[PDB]
């Protein structure tokens, strides 16, 4: 048991979902038709991969997942694509009219028409769990559905499932691939609304991923496909602790204990390595020391910010592949003596380490070199508040003129909701400032 249900919301959530589940299948040896020859227990089981996959009597391994979008064309590609046999038709849910990059339409006008159906389908999955751990919710900040519907769903999930854990993978907007001027509005609105209902949220800065694809993989103009394959590797690293077993494989929930010192301070910074092309990986072994060192290069971060000018409240290292504790300990020792790693005075300075022996996997036709060992660092740093600061400033510029606000008001929202949301974000920035101040 300890099942995990994934919910993929809007285009970004769905398309990232595609990449994640394809990768999971390849990591576990699950075919596109759902068959898994190595699984000798037919129709069920309590293996580690069962946290993410249920099983049918016919031997099909089915993602514990729901895909939701307010228009049909993205999910329609799942329905007709390579892994269409993987999902039951009822797991893939679509409306006919999207939120038009408007939080109001995602949370209210359009979202309300489909929310009950979505919850019913999620309930169907939950009732098949013997020990449900919680939910993972994938969505953009900037889209109308990703922002508006997600926050509606999170509110309703808190009612129907209480304090059952809810984690987010949230796509933070970047101008290189953004599709709406109002994405700062949608971002602040959903962040405010979801804050009390989320236990932990992994922000993914599209610009950070964009830069990584350009610099480390020599991709001239990254597409969502490029971005999502990288993002999936990082999500896989984080969930691998749940999907594989091993003596040194520390569960994500245990990292969470360290990562969340106060309820609102639940936004870890993810850093991943190695991201390297096949051309450059050839005849190049990246050691434990090398990939570990790369975790403190801000260019490898999932969110653009500078931890060297902030304070740490936690540092977690999630290794996978050919890695043993001896080498990790040596690597960390070196880093302790050379890097800019200052902790707040109220938390221990020790790094928490987990190791999963299953090696990193890559999708065919991908950009990433297949490597023998990889690492994802999860740190709690005051620096991540930079991301809030940038968004909040963009919000302030437009809202001072009430630009585009009539679109939200026309859908029933009030200016009070905007100022309330913005005030919460101001308080959040203040929170990250306060935790960094020394104790009396």
């Amino acid at each position: 048991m300890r099942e995990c249900i994934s919910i993929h919301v809007g285009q970004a959530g769905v398309q990232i979902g595609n990449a994640c589940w394809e990768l999971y299948c390849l990591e576990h040896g699950i075919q596109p038709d759902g068959q898994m020859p190595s699984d000798k227990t037919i129709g069920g089981g309590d293996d580690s991969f069962n946290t993410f996959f249920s099983e049918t009597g016919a031997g099909k391994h089915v993602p514990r997942a729901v895909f939701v979008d307010l228009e049909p064309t993205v999910i329609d590609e799942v329905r007709t694509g390579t892994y269409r046999q993987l999902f039951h038709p009822e797991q893939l849910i679509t409306g006919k009219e999207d939120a038009a990059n408007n939080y109001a339409r995602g949370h209210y006008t359009i979202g309300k028409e489909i929310i009950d159906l979505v919850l019913d389908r999620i309930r169907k999955l939950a009732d098949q769990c013997t020990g449900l751990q919680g939910f993972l919710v994938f969505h953009s900040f900037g889209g109308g559905t990703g922002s508006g519907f997600t926050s509606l769903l999170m509110e309703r999930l808190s009612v129907d499932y209480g304090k059952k854990s809810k984690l987010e993978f949230s796509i933070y907007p970047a101008p290189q691939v953004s599709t709406a001027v109002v994405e700062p509005y949608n971002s602040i609105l959903t962040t405010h609304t979801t804050l009390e209902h989320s236990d932990c949220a992994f922000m993914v800065d599209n610009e950070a991923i964009y830069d990584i694809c350009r610099r480390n993989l020599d991709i001239e103009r990254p597409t969502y496909t490029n971005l999502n394959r990288l993002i999936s590797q990082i999500v896989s690293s984080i969930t691998a602790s749940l999907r594989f077993d091993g003596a040194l494989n520390v569960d994500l929930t245990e990292f969470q204990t360290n990562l969340v010192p106060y309820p609102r301070i639940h936004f870890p910074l993810a850093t991943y390595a190695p991201v390297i092309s096949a051309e450059k990986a050839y005849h190049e072994q990246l050691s434990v020391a090398e990939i570990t060192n790369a975790c403190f290069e801000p260019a490898n971060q999932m969110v653009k910010c500078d931890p060297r000018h902030g304070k740490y409240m936690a540092c977690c290292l999630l290794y996978r592949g050919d890695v043993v504790p001896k080498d990790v300990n040596a690597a960390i020792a070196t880093i302790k003596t050379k890097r800019s790693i200052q902790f707040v005075d109220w938390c221990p300075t020790g790094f928490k380490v987990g190791i999963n022996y299953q090696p990193p996997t890559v999708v065919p036709g991908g950009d990433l070199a297949k490597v023998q060992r990889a690492v994802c660092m999860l740190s709690n740093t005051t620096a991540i508040a930079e991301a809030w600061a940038r968004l909040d400033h963009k919000f302030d510029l437009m809202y001072a003129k009430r630009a585009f606000v009539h679109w939200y008001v026309g859908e029933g929202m009030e200016e009070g909701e905007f100022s309330e949301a913005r005030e919460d974000m101001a308080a959040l920035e203040k929170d990250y400032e306060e935790v960094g101040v020394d104790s009396v």
Binding site: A104, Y108, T109, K112, E155, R156, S158, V159, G162, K163, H197, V409, G410, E411, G412, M413, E414
Partner: protein, 67 residues
């Protein structure tokens, strides 16, 4: 001690229930307030158009009473 133990878990239950309750009520309130607002905005739009219809009748009436 047993009494304290009972009071701790009871408090845990009550806080969880209060969180669920308040989340339920706040959402119900928001959806209702939102529906009222949208309905009012659409209603005000249609009323403006109805006034145009009224004005057009008056224009056509004005034409008749000049010939």
């Amino acid at each position: 001690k047993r009494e304290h133990e009972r009071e701790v878990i009871q408090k845990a239950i009550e806080e969880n229930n209060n969180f669920i309750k308040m989340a339920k009520e706040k959402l119900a309130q928001k959806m209702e307030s939102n529906k009222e607002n949208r309905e009012a905005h659409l209603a005000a739009m249609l009323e403006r158009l109805q006034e145009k219809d009224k004005h057009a009748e008056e224009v056509r009436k004005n034409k008749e009473l000049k010939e």
